[PDB]
């Protein structure tokens, strides 16, 4: 199924085919380079006169008009299943870790409709992470999207690895990391970081790096998602898809829209902003066979949450995890802001009546303590009422009991990590609020798992 290159204009290639045999939109098309190697290219527009405008997935330098181009007959198709685990891929599904070929039985196409209405889970289900702060105050939901805020050096990668570990240990689900505009240096660091913590073997990795053309960065997330879809649909797993950064997916969309000549929408974004996002996001969902939970780092241009990029991304989020440097500097790890983090499924309907009551109780105490921080610093502790002094006491214990040693820090801290189930997290914080541990010293609650381990640590002090 053959074609001739008629035009080359940056990362856009116009290819002429013969009358009856024009590739479908989104089909992969290969061109053998004169210099050696293959350039893969994705069909975008049917211009007429049997021409297709296509978006390149690598450099078009060195191409010549009149070269042969071959329709592969389907979209970009990518390895799935157990052969992907522990490996590092590019957008095309080719391995880039220099560990030879990937002997996978199947290759699935990266473009695909969203799951049918009949296939959908019809009730919100909590995804237990084993991490106290998250499970209690801003729980992750099985079908759902989670927005991961936090700057440099607050614990993003450590947290993402611990989630890979704890989904793998206890629910037996796998993970995929999609680096959308990954910086090559930081891909290399993340590979070695995951190899050392051992989480690598539970995770497929896909990098569409900052130096690749827009097409690559636009579609690399779909490559990762396609791998996760296998583990959901054909091994009934609860799967984690990590995307860093989902803004760069939207930005690559606007870059490619510009080169296709499309009229811009509000704030210069592509007119297909919402639909392009929906085609990615709606595939991340819980079906009857299993679940994909997505955990997405989200850039906010000009600090403006009303900007079309984050505004459209926000419509799909179920939860947020706000990492704050202030907490990291105090030694509270994971450094999750227990007031700023939120979840749509922290409601009595989904977690129990008790869970909700406890979580709101915890947040009330923390909020009050936060309000008194200024008053305490100046007027001192004698100025507070007896009710407030008791709240400050508990707030400080609560704040420490939200910290937790991670399995993936076992090498660095030298202390064993802890998985704490939801039942135990709720029980622990319930008891602190009730006053059952007002006589334990504060250090007892710091870096422990269950409430029982805090009682045990008190004896050692």
């Amino acid at each position: 199924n053959k074609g001739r290159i008629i035009q080359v204009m940056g990362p856009v290639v116009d290819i002429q085919f013969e009358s009856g045999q024009l590739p479908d939109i989104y089909n992969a098309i290969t061109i053998e380079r004169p210099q050696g190697g293959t350039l893969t290219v994705e069909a975008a527009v049917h211009l007429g006169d049997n021409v297709v405008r296509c978006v390149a997935m690598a450099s078009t330098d060195g191409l010549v008009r009149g070269l042969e181009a071959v329709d592969t007959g389907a979209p970009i198709s990518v390895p799935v299943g157990k052969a992907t685990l522990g490996r590092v891929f590019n957008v095309l599904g080719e391995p880039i870790d220099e560990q030879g070929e990937v002997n996978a039985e199947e290759r699935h196409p990266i473009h695909r409709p969203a799951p049918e209405f009949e296939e959908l889970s019809t009730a919100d289900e909590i995804l237990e992470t084993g991490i106290k702060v998250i499970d209690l105050l801003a729980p992750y939901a099985k079908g759902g999207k989670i927005g991961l805020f936090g700057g440099a050096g607050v614990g993003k990668t450590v947290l993402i690895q611990e989630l890979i570990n704890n989904v793998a240990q206890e629910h037996g689900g796998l993970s995929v990391f999609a680096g959308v505009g990954e910086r090559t240096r930081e891909g290399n660091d993340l590979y070695h970081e995951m190899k050392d913590s051992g989480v690598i073997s539970k995770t497929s990795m896909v990098f569409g790096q900052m130096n690749e053309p827009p097409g690559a960065r636009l579609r690399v997330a779909l490559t990762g998602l396609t791998m996760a879809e296998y583990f959901r649909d054909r091994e009934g797993q609860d799967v984690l898809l990590f995307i860093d950064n989902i803004f760069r997916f939207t930005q690559a969309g606007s870059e490619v829209s510009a080169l296709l000549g499309r009229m811009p929408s509000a704030v210069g974004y592509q007119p297909t902003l919402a639909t392009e996002m929906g085609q990615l996001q709606e595939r991340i969902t819980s079906t009857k066979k299993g679940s994909i939970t997505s955990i997405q780092a989200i850039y906010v241009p000009a600090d403006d949450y009303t900007d079309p990029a984050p505004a459209t991304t926000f419509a799909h989020l179920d939860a947020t995890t706000n990492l704050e440097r202030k907490l990291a500097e105090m030694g509270i790890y994971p450094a999750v802001d227990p007031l700023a983090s939120t979840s749509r499924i922290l409601s009595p309907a989904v977690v129990g009546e008790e869970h909700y009551r406890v979580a709101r109780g915890v947040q009330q105490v923390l909020q009050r303590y936060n309000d008194l921080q200024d008053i305490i610093a100046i007027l001192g502790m004698d100025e507070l009422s007896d009710e407030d002094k008791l709240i400050v006491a508990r707030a400080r214990k609560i704040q420490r009991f939200l910290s937790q040693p991670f399995h993936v820090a076992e090498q660095f801290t030298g202390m064993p990590g802890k998985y704490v189930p939801v039942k135990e997290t709720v029980r622990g914080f319930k008891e602190i609020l009730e006053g059952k541990h007002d006589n334990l010293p504060e250090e007892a609650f710091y870096m422990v798992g269950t409430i029982d381990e805090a009682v045990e640590k008190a004896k050692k002090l």
Partner: protein
Amino acid sequence: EVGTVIQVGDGIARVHGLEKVMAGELLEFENGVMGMAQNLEEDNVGVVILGPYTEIREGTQVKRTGRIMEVPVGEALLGRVVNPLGQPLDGRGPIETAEYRPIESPAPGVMDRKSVHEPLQTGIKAIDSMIPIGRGQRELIIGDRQTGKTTIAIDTIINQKGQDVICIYVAIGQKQSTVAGVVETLRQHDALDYTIVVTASASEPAPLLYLAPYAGCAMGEYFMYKGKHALVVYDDLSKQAAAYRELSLLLRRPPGREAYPGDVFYLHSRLLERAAKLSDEKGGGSLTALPFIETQAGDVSAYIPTNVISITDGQIFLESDLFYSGVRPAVNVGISVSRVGGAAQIKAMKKVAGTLRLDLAQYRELQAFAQFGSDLDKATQAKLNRGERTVEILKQDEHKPMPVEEQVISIYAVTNGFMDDIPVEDVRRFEEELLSFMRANKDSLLDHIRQTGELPDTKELDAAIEEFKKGFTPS
């Protein structure tokens, strides 16, 4: 009556042939996917594809259907989940119906209507008392994401159980998981058998999101023009407008404010004018509309929100600060309004609620200066104490609609001072305990209201509440 595709991109195709095609005609592509003739040019046709378009290319063939853009209609849709073309998504097989209705259709003219006078009870105290909706009204539900908009419409549909009102939930641009959740919630409250569900999920091509509200409108119109009463929910028109912008920009139509086309107002105005209350001569039927707008950071002065505000007969604004502080439903009393008003209310409710909105608007303003407990003058002290209690009454749990007769008693109780000696934290339990008492023991009073629509004898009612009070233990 065939044509061939000359050019395609982004779900828009130019087609050679189809010489005899109508403007707005439904077309079928070679692979079963439908389309719509939009532009009749000198020797080609502009066609918008209404479904998956990867398998459509240059050379694909297109058949006319000889039918203007239409949806299947009638009783066969009740309890079914369909897309904007009327194709069943729930996997319970075909939609057996002989009646169709066109997606674009003229609105009832100036002489075909009657003033709205019949209640549509939402079952939500805050709404039915302060922002009353009537049959034939268009009432905008507007607010940020996660302020409780969808739950208002779901609760309203549920409360139409046994009121002989056909409901249509149109889901434009939502996540499909959410839509699956909605149908399941309706099933469990036994509200699905009188409800049609139209859905253009976020992954669907823009033209389906564009058409979804018009399809739902036609489905409800059918019942209106046969003298029955319907309710349509568009959740939401923000995403529909964005989809129509995508479409307009792909056709290179000049952008204006926020890149929307000039006719984006017309998009919503034609839709919402088709909802109405018909005259006695035209059968007396009604179509009531609840369009949704999703604001960004509470900006009600943005382009699309102002358009839809200027179209509808009032709005219910939901505010984030109220929502996250535990005032749910989170109705901003100052901004919200019903242009129909007391006309859409039973006389009992119009009496007890008369000044309720203005009373709470004054409460919320005066609440800023409430730090002076015991120091503040006794007039304002009492107003704040009455206010906190009425706020507690207007809080209301999700999926728990209240009959009108029970709302009138509860609002009567608090507004005539019967909870002034009760702790603020006990007010909500006092209400629940009061109504179970009224149902079990004083049903003759409740029944008066359901039959006459009037308050019972105020002396009998005062006595009955004070009777209940003597068996109530505070904390």
